[PDB]
């Protein structure tokens, strides 16, 4: 189980 | 802010290049230049490559591209992550993670989410990991992201059932 960094939402 | 300013500039450039429909060579040159500007503004090299890849994959998913051109985009992202010192297995893992996290955040229905999962499994398998491990990685990414978004028990069961279908379709 590898921890995963939070996704960054894409600009409009 | 410096970091976010560079990120927005890179995003504009990558998305506009993709919208133009230019080939993968010109696209790779655009990604190189985006990573160079991110790196010039104090972002770690690996982190800059990661951000470029996420921008590319997220735009390509938003445009609703077919599975073949989408997996080509994924191969491009993996190649860039490789070129910036990321292990190929870790590179494919990151790209698949980007794709699947964006798909879950979009609220995409289950029939299409399973196709997205199968695509991530295809690229992980093509890199050189077993289908069982690749499906387990996909399921892991999906479950972790769903649990981190604070989803309710109902959506959690739906996610777990989707992941279990994936696993018993690809080696269990």
Author numbering:
A (entry chain B): -2 to 9
B (entry chain A): 0 to 171
What do the authors of the reporting publication say about this deposited model?
Here, inspired by natural and re-engineered protein–peptide systems, we set out to design proteins made out of repeating units that bind peptides with repeating sequences, with a one-to-one correspondence between the repeat units of the protein and those of the peptide. We use geometric hashing to identify protein backbones and peptide-docking arrangements that are compatible with bidentate hydrogen bonds between the side chains of the protein and the peptide backbone. We design repeat proteins to bind to six different tripeptide-repeat sequences in polyproline II conformations. The proteins are hyperstable and bind to four to six tandem repeats of their tripeptide targets with nanomolar to picomolar affinities in vitro and in living cells.
For the polyproline helix, there are roughly three residues per turn, and, probably because of this, we obtained more designs that target three-residue than two-residue proline-containing repeat units. Crystal structures reveal repeating interactions between protein and peptide interactions as designed, including ladders of hydrogen bonds from protein side chains to peptide backbones. Our results show that by matching superhelical parameters between repeating-protein and repeating-peptide conformations, and incorporating specific hydrogen-bonding and hydrophobic interactions between matched protein and peptide repeats, we can now design modular proteins that bind to extended peptides with high affinity and specificity.
